[PDB]
Amino acid sequence: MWQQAIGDALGITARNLKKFGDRFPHVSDGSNKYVLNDNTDWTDGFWSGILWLCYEYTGDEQYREGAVRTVASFRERLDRFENLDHHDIGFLYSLSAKAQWIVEKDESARKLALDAADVLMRRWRADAGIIQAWGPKGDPENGGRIIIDCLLNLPLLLWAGEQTGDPEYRRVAEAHALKSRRFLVRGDDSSYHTFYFDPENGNAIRGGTHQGNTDGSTWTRGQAWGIYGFALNSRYLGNADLLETAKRMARHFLARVPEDGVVYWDFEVPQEPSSYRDSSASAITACGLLEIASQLDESDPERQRFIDAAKTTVTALRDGYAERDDGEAEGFIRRGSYHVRGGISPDDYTIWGDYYYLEALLRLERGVTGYWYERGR
């Protein structure tokens, strides 16, 4: 049963919209209140996504109008190019502008998403064959660095390619996804957080972490980005190798889920209650598991196993981590972690965790698949 779980999210969201106003939630910091920003981070799209999902579930225009207002903010953000010189254009615009196009076919929203996709293409580095994740072009430290999270920024490009017919979008996304599979994914099915290439020729330099415990550890959200990310790219590209990788990474993740069903922040640290968790990694994986299953043939016995693993994850989140709408709580699930070693919100709400938790509930209850691709594709 997912209706009551969704109900708490609907209540929390409706109240949040009236409190946040035109502001955007990011993460909490030691309390049940979200730290807010004026659309200046990489997570603003998750708020839009949540509003759109709530609208799709209820048909209640209070959610739609809030979403539309955030889209207007995104139109302004792009026109002013405020903090958009990085790869997170996908997370920001797929869940806001593209989402509105998916929900109600708004032409201006479609244009905004395409304008955004065009801006994201500026991050492509022809000489290295990758999308630069962080910093300005040529940045000494990150000029040739990619991160596994970027897999979720590719849908915006793939979608833009199918909308415009411009083969460049798919070419770049496919190349980046394949390069990610070869260098970000490890031989034991674990994964690196980031990887460095020579900006001049694309030679592989080394793998390295940013939010994981060590360069060779397994940041669980990173593993999660791989699971859902490779599955989303596999759908767009009809690439069986990417789907296989998503499955391998998923099995690796699942074999390391603790007794309460929600993962710790890194698989290579003490797997005991004293270690911080990352409910957001589990939420992302729940969506990834369902995505994987949707691409498997009905005759494949592992299909139902992936679906059940997803239901079990959502249940674990609902029962042990979900916030009830008590008129105060501003987040859907507790114990997410942003940057543990950096001491940044290690036991808090994360708006992305909230978005994926709700997307999983909508997938399970209504078959609503989010805003990574057109419905029916």
Cβ-Cβ contacts under 8 Å for 224 (sequence gap 6 or more): 253, 280, 281, 282, 284, 285, 288
| CA–CA distance, 163 with 70 (Å, rounded to integer) | 23
For residue 68, give both structure tokens.
């539309």
E strands of 72-177, at which residues? 124-125, 130-131, 145-147
Cα maximum dimension of the chain:
55
| CA–CA distance, 46 with 327 (Å, rounded to integer) | 21
Q: How far is CA 44 from CA 39, 73, 119, in A?
A: 6, 10, 17
Mapped onto helix, strand or coil, the DSSP state of residue 285 is helix
Helices (H), 185-337: 220-237, 240-254, 279-294, 301-320
Mapped onto helix, strand or coil, the DSSP state of residue 25 is strand
Query: What does the chain come to in residues?
Result: 377
This structure's resolution (Å) is: 1.8
For 311-357, the three-class secondary structure string (H helix, E strand, C coil) is HHHHHHHHHHCECCCCCCCCCCECCECCECCCCECCCECEHHHHHHH
Whether the Cβ atoms of residue 57 and residue 10 lie closer than 8 Å to each other = yes
Q: Which of 38, 44, 79, 149 is catalytic?
A: 149
- CATH code of the domain covering residue 283: 1.50.10.10
Q: Which of 44, 88, 347, 354 is catalytic?
A: 88
88 is catalytic: yes
| CA–CA distance, 73 with 23 (Å, rounded to integer) | 10
For residue 162, give both structure tokens.
């199918």
Radius of gyration over every alpha carbon of the chain, rounded to an integer in angstroms:
19
Count the domains in the chain. 1
Experimental method: X-ray
Whether the Cβ atoms of residue 76 and residue 139 lie closer than 8 Å to each other = no
Which residues form the domain of 314? 1-377
Quick one: CA torsion of 362, 366, 367, 371, rounded to 10 degrees? -50
Cβ-Cβ contacts under 8 Å for 288 (sequence gap 6 or more): 224, 227, 228, 229, 231, 246, 250
In the block, residue with structure tokens 């539309």? 68
